[PDB]
Amino acid sequence: GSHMTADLKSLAKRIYEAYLKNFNMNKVKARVILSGKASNNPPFVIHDMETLCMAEKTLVAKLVANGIQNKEAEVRIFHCCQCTSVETVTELTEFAKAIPGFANLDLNDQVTLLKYGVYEAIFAMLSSVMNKDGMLVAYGNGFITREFLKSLRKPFCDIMEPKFDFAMKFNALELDDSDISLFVAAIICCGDRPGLLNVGHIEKMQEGIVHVLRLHLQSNHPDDIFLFPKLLQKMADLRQLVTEHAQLVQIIKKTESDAALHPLLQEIYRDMY
Ligand SMILES: CC(C)(Oc1ccc([C@@H]2CC2(Cl)Cl)cc1)C(=O)O
Ligand SMILES: CC(C)(Oc1ccc([C@@H]2CC2(Cl)Cl)cc1)C(=O)O
Numbered sequence: 001g002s003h004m005t006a007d008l009k010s011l012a013k014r015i016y017e018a019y020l021k022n023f024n025m026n027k028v029k030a031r032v033i034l035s036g037k038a039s040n041n042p043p044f045v046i047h048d049m050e051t052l053c054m055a056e057k058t059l060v061a062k063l064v065a066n067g068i069q070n071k072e073a074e075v076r077i078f079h080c081c082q083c084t085s086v087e088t089v090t091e092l093t094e095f096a097k098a099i100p101g102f103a104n105l106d107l108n109d110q111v112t113l114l115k116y117g118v119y120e121a122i123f124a125m126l127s128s129v130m131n132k133d134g135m136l137v138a139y140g141n142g143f144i145t146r147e148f149l150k151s152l153r154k155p156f157c158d159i160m161e162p163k164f165d166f167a168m169k170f171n172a173l174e175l176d177d178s179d180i181s182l183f184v185a186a187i188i189c190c191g192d193r194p195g196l197l198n199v200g201h202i203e204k205m206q207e208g209i210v211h212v213l214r215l216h217l218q219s220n221h222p223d224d225i226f227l228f229p230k231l232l233q234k235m236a237d238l239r240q241l242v243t244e245h246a247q248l249v250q251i252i253k254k255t256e257s258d259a260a261l262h263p264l265l266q267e268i269y270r271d272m273y
Contacts, residue, residue, distance in 0.1 A: 004215050011100065012182060012212050018098030019181030022091045025140060026177045027128040033140045034131050043136060043143040048151075049073060055142060074156035075259045077144075082262040084137070088125070089118045089264065092188070099185050101205040109202060112195050115268055117188040119245065120238040124184060127167035135160075155252055159245075166241055170234060173227065179220060182213040183231060187238065243273045 004012075020026060032038045046052050052073060056063060059080070063069040068079045093114055096102045102110065129136040134145040149160045175183070189206035191199050214228045221227045246269050253261050261269070 002215065004219065008212050008215060011208070012178070012216050014098055015185050016178045016181045018095050019177060019184065022095040023088070023125065025129060025136070027175075027180060028177060030129045030136060030140065033136060034129075043141050045134075045143045045145065046137075047145040047148050052077070052148075071258060074152050075256075077152070078156065078159065078259070080137075082265055085122060086262055086264050088122050089114075089268070092118050092121055092184075095184070096188050099188060099205070099209065101201070101208075102188070105202065106197055109197055112193050113188055113190070113202070116193040116272065117190060118268065119242045120187045120235070121184045123163050123166060123238055123241055123245075124170065124187065124234075125180065126163060127170040128180070130164060130167040130171070132168060135164075155248065159248065162241060162244065166237060173224070173230060173234075174221070176220070179217060182209065182216055185209045186213050187235060190235075246273050
């Protein structure tokens with residue numbers, strides 16, 4: 001129907017609580033850091049090569065242990081960014097268990113849904129820690145400027161800017177964590193992924209989440225009448241954004257002998273698009 005019964009309201013709260021439990025950086029926390037109203041101690045700003053190398057003095061143990069300290073600056077940056085993606089994949093994998101029906105799926109279908117869904121979710125949630133000038137890193141303790149990322153040498157300067165472009169329009173929708181949690185659940189449940197076995201079952205799982213998403217958006221943002229259709233379009237945009245990101249990763253991986261794709265991320269991108 002069009003009214004939120006108790007089972008739907010409970011489902012929405014369960015997804016929201018799993019989102020808060022599994023993702024350390026939520027939008028409320030990110031925006032207070034980015035706003036600077038709860039503290040006069042801002043994140044360390046990485047805006048050029050000098051401040052990058054300053055920040056990396058704190059990270060020396062991790063860079064040394066990973067054999068990255070002497071790699072080119074661009075490679076060092078996106079090695080750390082890869083490690084962050086790996087953490088978020090792990091968190092999304094645990095989050096998906098809270099989606100009613102997900103754990104009941106064939107294990108191969110769970111793997112397929114997460115394979116194609118995680119980076120759409122990652123770039124959706126990445127918007128929460130982005131403003132027009134840069135993005136929070138290191139659990140909100142650092143802030144790497146958008147211009148410094150564009151200043152990197154090709155093709156590394158082409159990686160993050162499309163994600164900033166998406167985030168600025170996504171953030172204009174003014175979603176809160178309760179919306180984003182259901183949006184991320186809907187992303188994970190897409191029944192259109194390549195190689196899914198039990199499509200019918202997955203589509204019924206997806207329909208339940210998307211129904212709760214619509215009713216929740218209508219209740220939580222009553223003045224933005226078509227916010228739900230707007231978000232359906234954002235899901236399509238994310239699929240295109242990830243398709244292009246994966247293609248660019250393949251190009252870079254093949255023409256950059258000293259940059260290494262993280263093993264876990266290797267399997268994700270393997271035969272993706
Ligand atoms: C603190 C650490 C290593 O996370 C990081 C560290 C560095 C970065 C990137 C390079 C800048 Cl600083 Cl732009 C992102 C996440 C961690 O996960 O423990
Ligand atoms: C957002 C992020 C970090 O993008 C990248 C960017 C660069 C790389 C590294 C250099 C090769 Cl291409 Cl080996 C892998 C992934 C990701 O996909 O997790």
